[PDB]
């Protein structure tokens, strides 16, 4: 299961 | 998500924690929670903290993840982005980041993470990975 991308949160 | 879930309303469950990432006195770990609106047992809350007791302060803290394309992962701002020094008369400080999970299909949880901090004249970039979840049917009973 292929992975999503890279998330963070809003700076 | 425009779905937030504020700390004061998680209750901690008997899951022991995990830790992610352990060096140069920098630590992060993984407390799981059940969701606590009502309506959604495929969601996990996962309470990241983020420690120190570097003997210099950390600053410029991103953590990041990345979860598989059939969940989604939304992570809250997080408390704060520098950690003083180590002081043996002070209460040591914590950085708290709220970080969602939606597992609608209700697969294996695993989870990519990037970490860039700064200590002294150091930057430090990990990449690495996490997979001591808890089973994803349990997520409506902690």
Redesign the interface.
Known sequence: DDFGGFEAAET | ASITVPLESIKPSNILPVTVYDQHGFRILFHFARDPLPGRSDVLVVVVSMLSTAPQPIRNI?????????????????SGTELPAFNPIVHPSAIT?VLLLANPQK?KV?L?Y?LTFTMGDQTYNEMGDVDQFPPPETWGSL
């Open positions: 991103v953590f990041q993840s990345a979860v598989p394309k059939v969940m989604k992962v939304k992570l809250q701002p997080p980041q697969e695993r990519r990037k």
